Amino acid sequence: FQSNATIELSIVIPMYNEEDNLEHLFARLLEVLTPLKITYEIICVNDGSKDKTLKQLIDCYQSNRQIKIVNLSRNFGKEIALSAGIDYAQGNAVIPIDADLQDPPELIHELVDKWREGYDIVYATRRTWVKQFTAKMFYKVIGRMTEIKIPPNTGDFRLMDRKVVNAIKQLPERTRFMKGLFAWVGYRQTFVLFWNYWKLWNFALDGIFSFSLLPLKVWTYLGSIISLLSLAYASFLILKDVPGYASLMVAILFLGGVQLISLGVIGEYLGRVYEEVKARPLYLVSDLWGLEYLPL
Amino acid sequence: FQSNATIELSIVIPMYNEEDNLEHLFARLLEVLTPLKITYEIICVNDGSKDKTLKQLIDCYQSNRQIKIVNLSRNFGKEIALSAGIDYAQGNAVIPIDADLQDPPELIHELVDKWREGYDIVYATRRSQFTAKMFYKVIGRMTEIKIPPNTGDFRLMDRKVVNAIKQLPERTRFMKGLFAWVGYRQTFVLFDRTKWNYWKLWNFALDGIFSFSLLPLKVWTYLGSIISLLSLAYASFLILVDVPGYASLMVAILFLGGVQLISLGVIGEYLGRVYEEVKARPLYLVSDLWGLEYLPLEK
Amino acid sequence: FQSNATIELSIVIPMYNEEDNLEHLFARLLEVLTPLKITYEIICVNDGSKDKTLKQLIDCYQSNRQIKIVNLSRNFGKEIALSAGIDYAQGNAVIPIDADLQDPPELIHELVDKWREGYDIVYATRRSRQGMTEIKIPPNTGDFRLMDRKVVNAIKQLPERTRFMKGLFAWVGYRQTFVLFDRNYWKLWNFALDGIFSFSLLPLKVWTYLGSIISLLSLAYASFLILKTITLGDVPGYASLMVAILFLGGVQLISLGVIGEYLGRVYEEVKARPLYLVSDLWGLEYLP
Amino acid sequence: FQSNATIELSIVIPMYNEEDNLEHLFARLLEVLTPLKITYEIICVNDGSKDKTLKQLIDCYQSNRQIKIVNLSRNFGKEIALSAGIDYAQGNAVIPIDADLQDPPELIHELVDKWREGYDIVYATRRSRQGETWVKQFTAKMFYKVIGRMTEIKIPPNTGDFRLMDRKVVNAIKQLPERTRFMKGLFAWVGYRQTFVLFDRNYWKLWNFALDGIFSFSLLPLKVWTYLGSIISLLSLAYASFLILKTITLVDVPGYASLMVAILFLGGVQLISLGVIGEYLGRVYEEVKARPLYLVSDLWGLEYLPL
Ligand SMILES: O=c1ccn([C@@H]2O[C@H](COP(=O)(O)OP(=O)(O)O)[C@@H](O)[C@H]2O)c(=O)[nH]1
Ligand SMILES: O=c1ccn([C@@H]2O[C@H](COP(=O)(O)OP(=O)(O)O)[C@@H](O)[C@H]2O)c(=O)[nH]1
Ligand SMILES: O=c1ccn([C@@H]2O[C@H](COP(=O)(O)OP(=O)(O)O)[C@@H](O)[C@H]2O)c(=O)[nH]1
Ligand SMILES: O=c1ccn([C@@H]2O[C@H](COP(=O)(O)OP(=O)(O)O)[C@@H](O)[C@H]2O)c(=O)[nH]1
Ligand SMILES: [Mg+2]
Ligand SMILES: [Mg+2]
Ligand SMILES: [Mg+2]
Ligand SMILES: [Mg+2]
């Protein structure tokens, strides 16, 4: 009869219009977390639902000490409402879970076991020439574990140690932790076994611009050397071949073309500077049930 | 009788050259606030008045425990002088009121009524075509707050809303779009008795798409880049089809020279917004305070 | 008889190679501050002097309780060394003066009298001759002024406190007055242009609208006014090509000038390096 | 004997795949620090090593109270792993040393001697008299005008990575992201009391850092080009307004000789304006980014920051 006051595991569940599944969600999770003999909590983030999902949450909160509600002021999205629950999650390990149980909750028993071996981040991965080209370009930077990338694998069902949650707590990229932040932070990582390449390589471009200044730096010197090769081609060649229209239009279309993507890479990084300096917060909490406001 | 050390309501009245209306304003407010039987405070923000308005404020301060003065260092904006009073206003609900008193102060009896029901932001809009059908689907579900014949400047905000926007520079222009972003429980009450111009309302729709979004900068970067690869590839292909001479040489140099100027506009616009976000300069400066304490110098 | 804990007045002196003036500066200052019957402190900021200025300062520090030394790591300039002196200066009023006494210390008695009346900022501007406030063109108000504690705290975190006379004095407001005493026009509007960029943003928005509307008058003229009149099969080509490339190619450079001007100000606001570095302190405490 | 609570010296060593050198490193260092009779600590930064370097550090940690370990989450640069150790190093003086022992550790006796004399920064530049040429005299004269008499700590065949720093200096640059490249210009900007100690035991990267210095510690590359770019804009604007106001004629002057050059000159100066603007924009992103400089996975013999 020892009353333990420390929380070991946190289950963060972003929910938007999940009124029917609330009965099957909390019940199936209970038969998985009970045999673990580990103190836990369930953080339920209300993402501005209309179908009275909040009223049904307060009923589960009223008869379950492990149910805690984070009511958002409006609909902010899955990635943002999930970050809201992790901020209010004060456990040693954090496991985000979808409400429709697309992944089996029994994998929590497999996530916590590999977590107690020393690994700080534990993933859960399911199982033409584009499949051989994409898988080869990424192993040169991602590292040992790239199976979380190849479709239809998404690392949205994972376990993270408290050290990883606090590290990326102040980073605006914590909303899209799978967009590349997982590979930058490193730590001890592993996974357990159990699409659309147009959007897969859209993250490849979004990752090069976010974690690197190469697109801006490379085109700065590339756009500078062709400016020196420019001004020199009319410096010594003005004291006096002249194809006329065969190069008056070409130079107008070339020198004017290289500037448009120079303004493109500048406007891209400028928009990223605004996102980093803006004072507008990521989300707003309307009400809280079973939790305290932040900062504590 | 017992005492109470918690303020429940805070009204904020920015004042510039309001030497005349002080006697009628406080008398009118007292006959409205006293029947509520609720603890309140009155924040009067002297915004660099020149007609001895402050000298009359201090006299009202001396004889009324509810009067609290925030004297600014110089004359700032009416929106700025309003944010100063909200920063120094304690209490669970904040409602700013004007000094000319175009809207009846008795309307606060119903802003507080909808606030007790659970609504966090309660507007007071006056009663009186394609644009209204536009904003109802993209901007806000309650377009009646920012209608031409009435602006939502007479409103009541809960403490949770005041604290959430305390650090945002957009709190100066809360009606310029920030109200549609914060969410929360919103509702309005309807009443009857420059602005109101349609060019000034779409200026609010233009100032909003740039403040709360990156689309004007993102859609133009991708657009200016795809026309750039068309410009450099068609130039290489033209340097090895039809060569219309002046019918293309004048058009091309004048098209690229014009698309770069608008590209420089969206960059210079967002650069000015990045600048205003990183300034260490505050919105206002407080010269003197009556019945209040200074804010922590951390800021 | 009895002790006093709070300091009322603070005199801040930036010092660079002032080994000689120290005997005459402290003696003449004591002759003016003593009849005031007001507790005071003297903050001396050593701005990397090459001579024996610091050694003579510590000697005056040993035999005078009102002398306090702020030793900067290297030379940072008169403006930065003066901002450092005010940062370490406690006291309801702050009066900065120079070591070479072009500013007569006897004006301190007149600046403190205007401050007693309620003025928050009292300037000491030299008389002009030659051929409110706004004395910023002939000799003009220098760094000789009085500022209440409320003013120095308001602009403490502001980087513009270094150049307080370049425009920040007109932005802060407060109760201001000046005092006249005796004994280039290019720098006039160089500082007037330095102010219209820091406290306005209008030079950026005015050229954004002007640069965009002439981009509308531009694009529309050749997109389908030239395309609609030449689709049938024109203005003097060379006369129209030269006037187009040099009007459009040049207005972009002014757009690049204002954008590059405001980009540098963003870099100065967000840079993490400090304005100065203190090497040693005498009779003071470190910040924060 | 009695106990002392203040640490006088802090030795920081970044370590990446130094499994073999750990035995000789701690042994040779202990024979240099023991005669000093001052309290010291050794901060070891595990910069994501791949072999068993961390396993051997913990054993040395288990039998030496001066050994302290900072295990980074992954492999960063040498400049980053060294800044991580300085953050966790507590002591009146800080001396960074390499693990492969490229410079003799007996110079610590000379660095501490110059530190107690009042110098806040004490360098240890190698004494090399070879390579004296006209290019070595031009760079020396150009760098002496901004760095000072101390500028001798950066000859081509040596740097200033072996140095002593007082606590006042490591605190002054603690929050500065330029602390990693401290020997890229930041040393000349702080301007504390500096000196060096001599011992005997490329020009591409020298002027590449001199170009990286005028952009980092100045705005001249941006301010000079905006003024130079605006004055040649007035020259192109007025000269064009007069060429179009010259109505005393009507097919071409210098036709393709000047018009092809005009689009060329005005099109090249903009690319240089875009270069300096994009360069400083990337610097603004590096200053405002919330992403940290490193991440600590585990600590041995230390506490997490802030204290
Ligand atoms: O706007 C949204 C949409 C998603 N969700 C939650 O995020 C999870 C995503 O599940 P869904 O099946 O709707 O998306 P998908 O499975 O395709 O990723 C669900 O538990 C939702 O409750 C949310 O909180 N806000
Ligand atoms: O510089 C100013 C201008 C206005 N006001 C206050 O804001 C209100 C503006 O009233 P006005 O009739 O001019 O604006 P409107 O009634 O149309 O909102 C007045 O009550 C003033 O007290 C102010 O504090 N400072
Ligand atoms: O690099 C400098 C130059 C100026 N000063 C101080 O600033 C004051 C102004 O002196 P200066 O004659 O050079 O300026 P001016 O008289 O021309 O205004 C003097 O007391 C100096 O001690 C300084 O601290 N560091
Ligand atoms: O990626 C790296 C490379 C360097 N080092 C450390 O930094 C020092 C540099 O050693 P190296 O000989 O490789 O560099 P150099 O001697 O040429 O300066 C070594 O002690 C390493 O332990 C590190 O921690 N991470
Ligand atoms: Mg699902
Ligand atoms: Mg009015
Ligand atoms: Mg002088
Ligand atoms: Mg080595």
Numbering used by the authors:
A (entry chain D): -3 to 123, 129 to 195, 207 to 252, 259 to 314
B (entry chain B): -3 to 124, 133 to 197, 205 to 251, 258 to 316
C (entry chain A): -3 to 127, 146 to 197, 208 to 257, 259 to 313
D (entry chain C): -3 to 197, 208 to 256, 258 to 314
What text does the study give?
GtrBSyn, the PI-GT from Synechocystis sp. PCC6803, was the most promising. Indeed, we produced crystals of this protein, in the detergent n-decyl-β-D-maltopyranoside (DM), which diffracted X-rays anisotropically to 3.2/3.6 Å resolution. We determined this structure by multi-crystal single-wavelength anomalous diffraction (SAD)14 analysis of the selenomethionine-substituted protein. F215A, which resides in a functionally relevant region of the protein, has compromised catalytic activity, but the structures are essentially identical, and unless indicated otherwise, we show here the better F215A model. GtrBSyn crystals were typically soaked in UDP-glucose before cryoprotection and freezing, as this step led to better resolution and reproducibility in the quality of the diffraction pattern. The UDP-glucose donor substrate binds in a shallow cleft on the surface of the cytosolic GT domain, in a similar position to that determined in other structures of GT-A fold GTs19. A divalent cation mediates the interaction between the diphosphate of the UDP and a signature DXD motif20 (94Dx96D in GtrBSyn). The anomalous signal of manganese soaked into the crystals was used to positively identify the ion-binding site although magnesium appears to be preferred for optimal activity of the enzyme. Despite the fact that UDP-glucose was soaked into the crystals immediately before cryoprotection and freezing, interpretable density was only observed for the UDP, indicating that the glucose is either poorly ordered or was hydrolysed before data collection, as has previously been observed for other GTs21. To assess the PI-GT function of the enzyme from Synechocystis, we performed mass spectrometry on lipid extracts from E. coli cells overexpressing GtrBSyn, revealing specific accumulation of UndP-glucose.
Sugar attachment to hydrophobic carrier molecules for transport across membranes is catalysed by polyisoprenyl-glycosyltransferases (PI-GTs), integral membrane enzymes conserved across all kingdoms of life3. GtrB is a bona fide PI-GT as it carries out the first step in the glucosylation process, generating UndP-glucose on the cytoplasmic face of the inner membrane, which is later utilized as a glucose donor during glucosylation of the O-antigen. The structure shows that GtrBSyn is a tetramer, with each protomer consisting of an N-terminal cytosolic GT domain of the GT-A fold, a juxtamembrane region, two TM helices (TM1 and TM2), which form a compact stalk anchoring the intracellular domains to the membrane, and a short C-terminal beta-hairpin. The soluble glycosyltransferase (GT) domains are separated from the TM helices by a juxtamembrane region that positions the active site 15 Å below the membrane surface.
